[PDB]
Structures are given as structure tokens and as C-alpha cells.
Amino acid sequence: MQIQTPDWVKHAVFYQIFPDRFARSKQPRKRLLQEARWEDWDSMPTLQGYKGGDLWGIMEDLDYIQNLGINAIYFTPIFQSASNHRYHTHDYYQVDPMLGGNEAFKELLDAAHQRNIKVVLDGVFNHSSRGFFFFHDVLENGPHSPWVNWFKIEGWPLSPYNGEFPANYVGWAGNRALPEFNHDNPEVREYIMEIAEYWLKFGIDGWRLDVPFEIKTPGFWQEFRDRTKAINPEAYIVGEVWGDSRQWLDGTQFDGVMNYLFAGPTIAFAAGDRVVLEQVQSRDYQPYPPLFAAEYATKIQEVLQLYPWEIQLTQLNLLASHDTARLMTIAGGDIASVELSTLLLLTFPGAPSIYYGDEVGLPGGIDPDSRRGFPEANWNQEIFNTHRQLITIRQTYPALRTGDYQVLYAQGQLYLFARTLGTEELIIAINAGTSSATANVDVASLHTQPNKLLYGTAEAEWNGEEGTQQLSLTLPARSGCILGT
Amino acid sequence: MQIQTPDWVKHAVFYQIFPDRFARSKQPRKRLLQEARWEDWDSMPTLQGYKGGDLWGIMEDLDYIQNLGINAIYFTPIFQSASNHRYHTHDYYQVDPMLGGNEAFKELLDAAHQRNIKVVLDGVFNHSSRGFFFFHDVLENGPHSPWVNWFKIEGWPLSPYNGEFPANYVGWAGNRALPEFNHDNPEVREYIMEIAEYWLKFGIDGWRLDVPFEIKTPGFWQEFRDRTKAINPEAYIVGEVWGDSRQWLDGTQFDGVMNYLFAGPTIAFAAGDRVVLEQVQSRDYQPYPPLFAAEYATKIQEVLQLYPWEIQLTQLNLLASHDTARLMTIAGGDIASVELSTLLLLTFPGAPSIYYGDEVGLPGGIDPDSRRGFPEANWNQEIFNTHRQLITIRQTYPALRTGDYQVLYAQGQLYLFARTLGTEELIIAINAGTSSATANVDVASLHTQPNKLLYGTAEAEWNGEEGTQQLSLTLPARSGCILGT
Numbered sequence: 028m029q030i031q032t033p034d035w036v037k038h039a040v041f042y043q044i045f046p047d048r049f050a051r052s053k054q055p056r057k058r059l060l061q062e063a064r065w066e067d068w069d070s071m072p073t074l075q076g077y078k079g080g081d082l083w084g085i086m087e088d089l090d091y092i093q094n095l096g097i098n099a100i101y102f103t104p105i106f107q108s109a110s111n112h113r114y115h116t117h118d119y120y121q122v123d124p125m126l127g128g129n130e131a132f133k134e135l136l137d138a139a140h141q142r143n144i145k146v147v148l149d150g151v152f153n154h155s156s157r158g159f160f161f162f163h164d165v166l167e168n169g170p171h172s173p174w175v176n177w178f179k180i181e182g183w184p185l186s187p188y189n190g191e192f193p194a195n196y197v198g199w200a201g202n203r204a205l206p207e208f209n210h211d212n213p214e215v216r217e218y219i220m221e222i223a224e225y226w227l228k229f230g231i232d233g234w235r236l237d238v239p240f241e242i243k244t245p246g247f248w249q250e251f252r253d254r255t256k257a258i259n260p261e262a263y264i265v266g267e268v269w270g271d272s273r274q275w276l277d278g279t280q281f282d283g284v285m286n287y288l289f290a291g292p293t294i295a296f297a298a299g300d301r302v303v304l305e306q307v308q309s310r311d312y313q314p315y316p317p318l319f320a321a322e323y324a325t326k327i328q329e330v331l332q333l334y335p336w337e338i339q340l341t342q343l344n345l346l347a348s349h350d351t352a353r354l355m356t357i358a359g360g361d362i363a364s365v366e367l368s369t370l371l372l373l374t375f376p377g378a379p380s381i382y383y384g385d386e387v388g389l390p391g392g393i394d395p396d397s398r399r400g401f402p403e404a405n406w407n408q409e410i411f412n413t414h415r416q417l418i419t420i421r422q423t424y425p426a427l428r429t430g431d432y433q434v435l436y437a438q439g440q441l442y443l444f445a446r447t448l449g450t451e452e453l454i455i456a457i458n459a460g461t462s463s464a465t466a467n468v469d470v471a472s473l474h475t476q477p478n479k480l481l482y483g484t485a486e487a488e489w490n491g492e493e494g495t496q497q498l499s500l501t502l503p504a505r506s507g508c509i510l511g512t
Numbered sequence: 513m514q515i516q517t518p519d520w521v522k523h524a525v526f527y528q529i530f531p532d533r534f535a536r537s538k539q540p541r542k543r544l545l546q547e548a549r550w551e552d553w554d555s556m557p558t559l560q561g562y563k564g565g566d567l568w569g570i571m572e573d574l575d576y577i578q579n580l581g582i583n584a585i586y587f588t589p590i591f592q593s594a595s596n597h598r599y600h601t602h603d604y605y606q607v608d609p610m611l612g613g614n615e616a617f618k619e620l621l622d623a624a625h626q627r628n629i630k631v632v633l634d635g636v637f638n639h640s641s642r643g644f645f646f647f648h649d650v651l652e653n654g655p656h657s658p659w660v661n662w663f664k665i666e667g668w669p670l671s672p673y674n675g676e677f678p679a680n681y682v683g684w685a686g687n688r689a690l691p692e693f694n695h696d697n698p699e700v701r702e703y704i705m706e707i708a709e710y711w712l713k714f715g716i717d718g719w720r721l722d723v724p725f726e727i728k729t730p731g732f733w734q735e736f737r738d739r740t741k742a743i744n745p746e747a748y749i750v751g752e753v754w755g756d757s758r759q760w761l762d763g764t765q766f767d768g769v770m771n772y773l774f775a776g777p778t779i780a781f782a783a784g785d786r787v788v789l790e791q792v793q794s795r796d797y798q799p800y801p802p803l804f805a806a807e808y809a810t811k812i813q814e815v816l817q818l819y820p821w822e823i824q825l826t827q828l829n830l831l832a833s834h835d836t837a838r839l840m841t842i843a844g845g846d847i848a849s850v851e852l853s854t855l856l857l858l859t860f861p862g863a864p865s866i867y868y869g870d871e872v873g874l875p876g877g878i879d880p881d882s883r884r885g886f887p888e889a890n891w892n893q894e895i896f897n898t899h900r901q902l903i904t905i906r907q908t909y910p911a912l913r914t915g916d917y918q919v920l921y922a923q924g925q926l927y928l929f930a931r932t933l934g935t936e937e938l939i940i941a942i943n944a945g946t947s948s949a950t951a952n953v954d955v956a957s958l959h960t961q962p963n964k965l966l967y968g969t970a971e972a973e974w975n976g977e978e979g980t981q982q983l984s985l986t987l988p989a990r991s992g993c994i995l996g997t
Contacts, residue, residue: 060702062709070698073658107645109652117645118603125658158648160592160602166673167594167642167689173558173610188651189674204652213555217545224547 030278032341033233033263038428039145040418041380042097045349046105046126047113048399049383050084051077059124080401082127086135093142095386096418100139101147101235101265103349105132108156114237115156115204119222136230145232147263152219153241154198154205157187162206177215179207199241210244220254227255233263233282239275240268248280265343269311276334283342286377287312288330290346293371294357296323296442296459298364306352306393314357320459324437324444331376331432340429342377346385353384353391353398355410362388363505366413367457370483370507373417374427374446374455386414420481420509426451436468436500443468443500453477454510456485458502465501483508515763517826518718518748523913524630525903526865527582530834531590531611532598533884534868535569536562544609565886567612571620578627580871581903585624586632586720586750588834590617593641599722600641600689604707621715630717632748637704638726639683639690642672647691662700664692684726695729705739712740718748718767724760725753733765750828754796761819768827771862772797773815775831778856779842781808781927781944783849791837791878799842805944809922809929816861816917825914827862831870838869838876838883840895847873848990851898852942855968855992858902859912859931859940871899905966905994911936921953921985928953928985938962939995941970943987950986968993 057063058074058081068075085092085100092100105126107118122132139146155162165172165180166187181195187203199205208215223234234255239248248266255262266275269287276283291312294302299317307314318326331339346368347354358364365388373379384391388407389400421427430448437443440460446453454477458464465487470476476490476498485508487501502508542548543559543566553560570577570585577585590611592603607617624631640647650657650665651672666680672688684690693700708719719740724733733751740747751760754772761768776797779787784802792799803811816824831853832839843849850873858864869876873892874885906912915933922928925945931938939962943949950972955961961975961983970993972986987993 060699060706062706063702067698067702071702073699109649110656110658112652115652117648156648157652158643158645160643163602163641163643164594167597167600171595173595185673187673189671213552214545214558217548217552217556221545221547 028278030335030337032282032337033261035145035261036263036282036341036378038422039099039378040097040421041147041343041378042092042095042100043345043348043380043382044085044100044102045080045383046082046085046102047079047111048401049080050088050401051080052083052087056081056083056127058127061130077125079125081125082122082131082135084401086131086138089138089142089144093144095381095415096422097381098143099145099147099232101380102149104149104151104237109158112156112204114151115158116151117156117158118160120225133229140230145263147233147235147265148226148231149235149237149267150223151237152208152222153210153238154207157204157206159206176209177212178209199238207241210242210247216244216247216250220250223251223255224258227258227262232261233259233265235285236264236266236281239266239281248275252280263341267348271333273334276338278335278338283334283338283377285348285380286330286342286344288333289327289342289344289372289375289377290314292318292323292326292330293346293368294364295326296320297368297371297457298358298361299459301359301361301364303352303357303359306357308351308357308393311348311351320437320440320442320457323442324434328434339376343380344372344375344377345380345382346372347382347391349382352393353382353389355385355388355407356390356392362407362410365410367459367505367507369410369413369417370455370509371457373421374453374509376429376432376446379421381414387411416482424451424453424481424511426453433472435470435472436466438466440464441466441502445470445473447473450474453481455507456483456500456502456510457507458504461504463501463503465499467497467499470496470498477510477512479510479512481509481511485510513763515820515822517767517822518746520630520746521748521767521826521863523907524584524863525582525906526632526828526863527577527580527585528830528833528865528867529570529585529587530565530868531567531570531587532564532596533886534565535573535886536565537568537572541566541568541612543612546615562610564610566610567607567616567620569886571616571623574623574627574629578629580866580900581907582866583628584630584632584717586865587634589634589636589722594643597641597689599636600643601636602641602643603645605710618714625715630748632718632720632750633711633716634720634722634752635708636722637693637707638695638723639692642689642691644691661694662697663694684723692726695727695732701729701732701735705735708736708740709743712743712747717746718744718750720770721749721751721766724751724766733760737765748826752833756818758819761823763820763823768819768823768862770833770865771815771827771829773818774812774827774829774857774860774862775799777803777808777811777815778831778853779849780811781805782853782856782942783843783846784944786844786846786849788837788842788844791842793836793842793878796833796836805922805925805927805942808927809919813919824861828865829857829860829862830865830867831857832867832876834867837878838867838874840870840873840892841875841877847892847895850895852944852990852992854895854898854902855940855994856942858906859938859994861914861917861931864906866899872896901967909936909938909966909996911938918957920955920957921951923951925949926951926987930955930958932958935959938966940992941968941985941987941995942992943989946989948986948988950984952982952984955981955983962995962997964995964997966994966996970995 104113107121161174179197186192194203266281266284268284272284294314296318384402426446426448430446435443441464443456485502589598592606646659664682671677679688751766751769753769757769779799781803869887911931911933915931920928926949928941970987
């Protein structure tokens with residue numbers, strides 16, 4: 028049973044979207060009352076002047092997305108839930124009406140696919156909301172309810188909304204809004220597995236798993252993988268696990284996780300002291316303290332020799348997420364830190380992921396509604412071009428996607444590694460220092476001699492003999508470059 | 513715009529069913545987890561040994577139903593709601609999973625239709641439940657919720673479950689479990705109209721309207737009729753209104769109501785003193801005090817000259833309902849009262865309705881779970897035959913369905929009326945007394961002379977001259993009969 032992971036993931040460029048705040052469509056939209064008179068429309072305020080984003084919008088902006096060069100988008104939760112509480116699932120079998128429901132989602136899906144762009148959804152199965160039917164039945168029937176043993180019910184009576192009282196049931200992180208499921212209970216296991224299957228049949232391209240480490244019922248995720256893969260052998264399973272994910276990466280559970288273990292160090296190194304350290308994020312990743320090329324190298328090599336390589340190729344690398352401060356903001360505004368990080372991210376083994384906004388420099392606070400961006404131009408044309416250029420490159424050269432990863436130099440604030448697939452070899456260098464740097468590396472590992480600047484505009488590109496290759500590289504302060512040919 | 517009402521209703525025999533307590537199917541049923549392993553089934557108790565009724569059952573017993581001679585069944589609420597709280601709608605766009613959901617309902621519908629039997633559903637639109645999505649959003653978002661103006665919100669904060677506090681929102685009959693809608697709000701009007709349309713397209717045969725008199729937003733039910741009739745010109749609209757329904761019976765709203773104004777008197781007369789008078793029912797109808805033939809005649813004639821005749825023909829006559837004590841029980845056990853009432857009901861102008869169980873004598877208390885019957889034999893073969901016989905007759909002779917209604921005699925405890933359509937005339941007599949009775953009526957209204965006992969076995973069937981007809985009828989105590997030919 029050799030380990031296998033979706034090959035399309037291995038060459039994909041992900042784009043994480045927050046649909047409620049990404050884009051609202053143009054032409055009139057029968058948001059909720061689909062069958063409503065365009066005459067009585069002015070009579071219905073809520074629908075007539077709806078504000079936040081919908082799937083319509085996203086679908087309409089598919090041009091922009093694809094132009095950036097991202098071939099797969101993956102959202103937060105989009106199933107039916109109360110406003111700005113998308114994680115308090117109310118109904119898993121419906122897309123939220125305010126987003127356009129199943130009808131709109133269906134159109135986005137089809138639209139994205141004709142363009143050959145995948146779509147992954149965020150599954151929240153550790154807990155739901157008070158309105159979730161079965162919980163409701165329990166709240167409406169107390170002890171006499173048929174599904175009391177579907178949740179983690181402490182005692183009675185329950186105070187789901189009051190506060191000054193106990194609710195005698197377990198809520199995610201001690202909250203009475205996220206009633207936790209009793210995953211041990213096989214019936215629950217079944218209901219969930221069916222939700223996964225339903226959407227896969229619906230035609231979605233895989234699952235993101237919210238806080239999948241909270242669900243510890245043995246055998247769970249393996250079944251989740253079988254029942255999922257059964258429906259679609261090329262479906263992508265990604266757990267949002269911040270930290271050592273070896274428990275779920277033996278090849279029988281997830282295809283990979285959102286690699287925060289790559290995010291922290293990269294920023295620790297790429298931004299170092301510049302890291303704001305209020306926008307952390309310090310449940311999620313450790314982008315501190317600042318690292319030097321040698322510390323980053325040892326840290327990165329630790330990360331890379333941690334999971335089976337097939338999984339490493341289907342890891343979802345990132346620098347920002349809905350749960351964290353945007354990139355431009357976490358770097359105190361330093362463009363350099365943004366260009367250098369993205370450079371490492373887009374040249375790292377695994378699937379790179381961009382948080383909508385970062386390709387444009389859009390800033391993002393940590394909490395709350397210090398966010399927002401429907402991400403009006405209203406950009407940072409510099410950093411955007413970095414993003415689009417780097418993505419083309421990663422799509423132009425195969426070694427950057429599935430090549431190997433070998434550190435060549437790592438001293439002071441200068442870091443050089445090589446991505447190599449077959450005879451195609453590339454050298455990537457990062458000057459995280461403020462002073463123009465220069466390194467003489469013994470590149471005896473390579474079989475060729477990358478001497479063309481595919482990106483980065485660096486100097487000291489002097490090589491030499493062939494018996495035993497020798498290289499001298501000089502890069503401007505706070506810069507990076509890709510060498511090829 | 514001449515008044516029109518569904519002609520099929522005019523010749524239908526309705527059967528009111530309580531699906532949760534009518535019949536549970538036989539063969540294994542994947543009740544909730546449709547896609548579940550038959551191996552892990554013993555692992556899922558709730559589904560493995562489910563108790564109460566489902567639509568499967570009903571569908572399976574379609575033979576019995578059709579054998580009784582009922583051609584149209586109509587239920588209580590069956591949409592998603594908490595157990596034994598079917599009126600606390602949680603989701604109008606789903607049949608309750610415990611009943612078999614949309615998948616099972618679909619099969620019953622198809623099955624009933626191939627047998628040429630209609631199906632009407634109970635619509636509860638004046639209020640829902642705490643779990644109803646939009647209410648939930650309001651409970652989860654308080655003042656900041658987008659649909660606060662979708663309900664009747666008094667103030668803040670709300671205590672939807674506590675009790676010792678106000679909930680600052682209006683609940684049907686001062687209850688905090690039935691959050692009332694703001695029908696004035698056009699958006700609400702729209703959402704509802706769409707629910708009606710949805711199910712009609714789904715292929716249901718009309719709507720029963722729960723407490724439709726509580727929804728007083730002007731123009732409501734007329735729109736409800738247009739949008740409904742548009743989808744299906746032969747759809748049946750019935751309001752559950754106990755009392756003078758002239759407000760909704762002008763021909764532009766309902767096709768008729770559940771005629772409690774016929775139920776009360778009929779029992780007042782048919783059962784008189786025998787009426788238990790604890791099982792009333794004394795929000796619903798006035799089956800008291802006992803009436804004499806002359807009081808019943810004047811009362812019945814008042815009822816008949818109350819609505820346009822087209823509506824009278826599509827009125828839903830009844831003697832019992834889910835909201836009231838069964839017939840056999842309300843008559844203290846007196847079979848006579850049961851046979852006489854059914855006789856009047858099945859020979860009255862409009863659509864007759866039988867509450868499942870009454871055709872078998874099954875008893876029914878008023879509250880609570882002094883009910884039940886999956887209605888195991890376990891019958892009353894006498895009263896059943898009365899029911900089946902009388903139904904055949906009503907289906908055999910057209911005058912009993914759409915004929916006119918003329919009182920001939922009404923003195924003491926003896927009542928005689930005639931149903932006449934074209935040249936087909938029938939005489940119906942009721943001896944509500946304990947002593948064999950006899951009447952000499954001047955039947956100069958008739959053009960014929962019904963002299964054959966189609967039912968009832970009575971005596972004194974002596975007629976006479978033709979210039980001016982004269983009739984003498986003698987019936988045993990507590991008896992009735994139908995005369996024809």
C-alpha cells in the first residue's frame with residue numbers, strides 16, 4: 028500500500044478566499060427570495076441592498092484569479108450559519124443563502140472547472156452551532172431527546188444562551204456556541220462521512236479540515252480518507268494542523284496539512300526583527316525569534332525530513348491565513364520581507380498558498396474587523412508583479428514544484444539552496460541582511476551551472492572549472508534571485 | 513370572476529393521518545444515515561430500533577386506506593422539527609428525517625398518485641421554532657442580526673429557553689417556542705409564498721392552513737391563492753378555522769375550511785347528553801348542549817346558508833381532528849352516536865373527513881398520550897363496516913356529494929332531509945331518540961319516491977297518492993337510514 032497523494036495538488040497554486048468579504052456581484056441578484064417580483068424588490072431592503080461578498084462575485088472575478096496564475100481556490104466555511112459566524116454550522120447540506128446558496132455555488136464550481144481550477148471547501152466537523160437541528164432537538168427536548176448521546180452533555184438543565192448559568196454540555200474551547208459532537212458515537216461518524224461524500228459527489232475537489240486534531244476517535248480520519256477517496260481518488264484532504272502533523276501523515280489519513288511549520292521560520296528569517304509581534308498569531312505559528320541563515324536552514328531541513336516525501340509534495344505551504352494577520356501587515360509594512368517570503372514560499376516543495384489580498388499588499392489585522400479587503404486598486408503593483416512573476420516561474424520550471432531541496436550556503440544572513448529535478452537544477456538565494464552580501468559556495472552537488480537570472484537581479488555570478496565547480500554569489504541587501512539554464 | 517373550487521375535492525373522501533403514530537414500515541429502513549453499512553447498523557441504536565411512524569408505513573398500508581374508500585389523505589405537519597413538536601417547524605424545505613425525509617415522502621406521493629389518491633400537507637406559517645434558521649440568526653446575533661425585523665421582537669435581551677426572564681419577542685399564544693413571524697414584512701410574505709410553491713411543484717395536491725386567522729396582513733391569503741393556483745389550478749386550499757369563516761370564503765382566498773361548525777351541532781344532536789364533556793374540545797367546537805331535531809335543523813340550515821355554494825361543496829367536513837378527542841371516545845363509548853354522526857357526515861354537502869382510527873372505533877383522549885393507535889385488529893368490525901358501507905354509497909350516489917340539502921321533518925328527536933341532484937333524490941332520516949319513532953311527512957318537494965333501503969333498515973316506508981305525495985316513516989331507536997330508487 029505505497030503512499031499516494033493527488034498529483035494535481037503537486038503542481039497547483041492555491042488561493043485562500045474569504046467569500047463573505049472577497050467580492051459581491053454586479054447585476055441584480057435574487058439573493059434569498061429567488062422567486063421574487065423585481066417590482067417588490069425595493070420592498071425587500073435586506074436583499075435589495077445586501078453588502079458582503081457572495082459566490083457570484085468570486086465567479087465573476089475568475090478572470091483576475093486565473094490571471095494571477097492560481098489554479099485552485101479554497102475557502103473558509105460557506106455552509107449555512109448565522110451571519111459572521113461561518114464556523115457555527117447550522118446546516119451542512121446548504122451553502123449559506125447570503126452567499127448565494129447551492130444554486131450560486133453550483134455556478135461557481137462549473138465556472139471554475141471549465142477554466143480548469145479546483146475548489147476545496149472547509150469542513151468543520153468537531154462542532155456545530157446551537158441551531159444545528161439535532162442539537163436543537165436536544166435543546167427542545169432536554170433529557171427526553173433522541174440524540175442527547177450525540178453530543179457531550181454534562182448534566183441538566185442547559186443554558187445555551189444565558190451565561191450566568193452552566194450549560195451542562197461541552198463547547199469547543201469552553202464556548203456554548205460551538206456544541207461539540209460525540210465523535211466516538213458511530214452514528215455521528217456516519218452522518219459526518221455522508222456530508223463529506225455528499226459534497227464530493229456534488230463535484231468539489233477536496234476537503235480542508237478545521238481543527239482535525241480535536242477529533243480523536245480512533246479510526247476516524249482513516250475512514251474519512253477511504254470514504255472520500257472512494258468517491259474521488261483525486262480528492263485533496265488537508266488538515267489545518269499547526270505543528271507536528273506526523274500523527275495524521277502516515278499516508279492513511281490526510282494528504283497533508285497547512286504547513287505553519289514552514290510559515291513561522293520563513294518569517295522569522297525573512298522578516299526577522301521586523302515582525303510586528305502584535306499580529307502574531309501566537310497560537311498558530313512561531314514567526315519569532317528572528318533566525319539567521321544557518322538557523323533557518325537547520326529548521327527548514329527539520330521540517331523537510333519530517334513527513335514522507337509524497338506527502339511533502341502535497342503539503343499546503345502558506346504565510347498567512349484567515350486565522351492570522353496578513354503578510355504585508357505582519358511585516359510592519361516592509362516590502363522586502365514580503366518579497367523574500369513569497370520567494371521562499373513559491374520555491375518550496377509542496378503546494379503554495381496565497382491569502383487573498385497578499386498578492387496586492389492589502390493589510391490585515393489579527394482581530395477584529397481591522398480586516399477588510401474586497402481585494403480596488405488599491406493594490407501594490409510592485410508586490411503584485413512579484414507574485415505573478417514568481418508564479419509563472421514556478422509553473423515554468425518543474426524542479427520548483429517537485430524537485431529536491433538541498434541547502435548550499437547558509438551563513439550570516441545569506442541563504443542558498445537548490446531545487447533539482449532530473450537535469451533541471453535551479454539555485455535560489457536570499458539576502459536577509461541589510462548589507463550587500465557575497466558568498467563563495469562549493470557547488471559540487473550540481474551537475475550543471477545555473478547562470479541566468481530568471482528573477483532577482485543579483486551579481487557575482489562567477490563560476491569556474493568543471494572538475495570541481497566553485498561559485499561566488501553577490502546579492503544586494505534584502506534581495507533574492509533565481510538562477511537557471 | 514365567478515367563484516371556482518377544485519372539482520375533485522367535491523367528490524373526495526378525506527382521511528386525516530398523524531404520520532408519527534400511524535404506521536412504521538417493515539423491511540429495514542436506512543432512516544437517517546441513508547448511506548450506512550448494514551454491518552454497522554447494530555452499532556446505531558436510534559436508527560436500528562426506531563419506534564414511531566414514518567411515511568414508509570403509510571405508503572405500505574395504502575391498500576387498507578384505499579379499501580376503506582378514501583381517495584385523499586392529509587396529515588399534520590411533517591417538515592423538519594424536533595421530536596413530538598411537529599408544529600415547531602425547523603426547516604420547511606425538508607420532510608423530517610425520522611419520517612423518512614423528502615426521499616420517503618417522494619415515494620409515498622408517487623405511490624398514492626398511481627392509485628389516484630391525493631395528498632395535502634399542513635402548512636404552519638404563522639410561526640416556526642427557535643431552530644428555524646433566521647430566528648437562530650437573530651438569537652445568535654441579537655440586535656446586530658439582519659432579520660430582527662422578520663419577527664415580533666419586543667426588546668433585548670431575549671431569553672428563548674430560560675423562562676424566569678422575559679423573552680422580548682412575541683410567541684404564539686405567549687409561548688417562547690413558537691416565534692411568530694412578521695407577516696406584514698413583505699420579505700416574509702415572499703419566503704412563505706415560495707414554500708407553498710415549492711411543495712406544489714414537488715407535486716403535492718394542496719395545502720391545509722394551520723391557524724390561518726392569526727395572519728392578518730391584508731392581501732396575504734389572496735396572494736397565497738394566486739401564487740398557489742398559478743402552479744396548480746386544481747390545488748386545494750383549506751384553512752383550519754373553527755367558527756364563522758366568511759372572512760376567508762369570498763372566493764378569493766381559501767377553497768373552504770375544516771367545518772367545525774358542522775361538527776359541533778352534529779354531535780350535539782347525534783350524541784346529545786352522551787357527550788363526555790371532558791374531551792371537549794371547547795376551544796375547537798361546541799358539541800353541546802344537546803340539540804333536538806328542530807334545533808339541529810335550524811343550526812344546520814344556518815351553516816349551509818353561510819358560504820357561497822361552490823365553497824360549500826369544497827368544505828372539509830369532520831367530526832374529529834388531531835386537536836380533538838376521537839369520536840368513539842367523545843361519545844362515552846356509545847356506538848349509536850358514532851354510527852349516526854358518521855351517517856350525517858357522509859351525507860352532508862362538502863368533502864367528508866375521517867380521522868384515522870375512527871373507522872375502527874379506536875379511542876382518543878384529548879391530551880396527552882392518552883392517544884395512541886397505529887390504527888391491530890384491534891378494531892370495531894361493526895363501526896368499520898358502517899364506515900366502508902356509507903363511503904361506497906356516497907361514491908355510488910352523486911346527490912350525496914353535490915346534491916342540494918332540504919329538511920323535510922324535524923320534530924322531537926327525528927330528523928329527515930333530502931339530497932337531490934337532477935332526478936336523483938335520496939331521503940336520510942335520523943332517530944336520535946331512545947324510542948322507536950315514526951313521522952308522517954308531506955314530501956311534496958320531491959318528484960320521485962325513495963322506497964328502497966340503501967342502508968339503515970327502517971320501517972314505515974308507506975307512501976301513497978301522486979297528486980300530492982305523503983310519507984310515513986318509522987325508525988328504530990337510535991338509528992338512521994338512506995332511502996333511494
